[PDB]
Copies of this chain bind each other. A is one copy, B any other.
Amino acid sequence: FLDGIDKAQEEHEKYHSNWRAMASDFNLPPVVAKEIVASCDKCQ
């Protein structure tokens, strides 16, 4: 939560990882990772 959203989105714009990976690596709740994935146009 401590600036994890910015790093999560900046790494998702390059690798497009699964929401579980973002939740585990950056310590974010699953809902944040799911909505970050949804915000990606390439991913669904």
Which one, B1, B2, B32, contacts A1 given CB within 8 A? B32
**Which residues of chain B come closer than 8 Å to A35, judged between CB atoms?**
1
- The contact sample of 5 A-B pairs, CB cut-off 8 A, is A1-B32, A1-B35, A2-B39, A5-B5, A29-B31
Q: What is A's interface to B at a CB cutoff of 8 Å?
A: 1-2, 5, 29, 31-32, 35, 39
How far, in angstroms, from A29 to B2 measured CA to CA in the complex? 16
**Which residues of chain B come closer than 8 Å to A31, judged between CB atoms?**
29
How far, in angstroms, from A27 to B31 measured CA to CA in the complex? 14
**Which residues of chain B come closer than 8 Å to A32, judged between CB atoms?**
1
- The minimal Cβ–Cβ distance linking A40 to chain B, given in whole angstroms, is 13
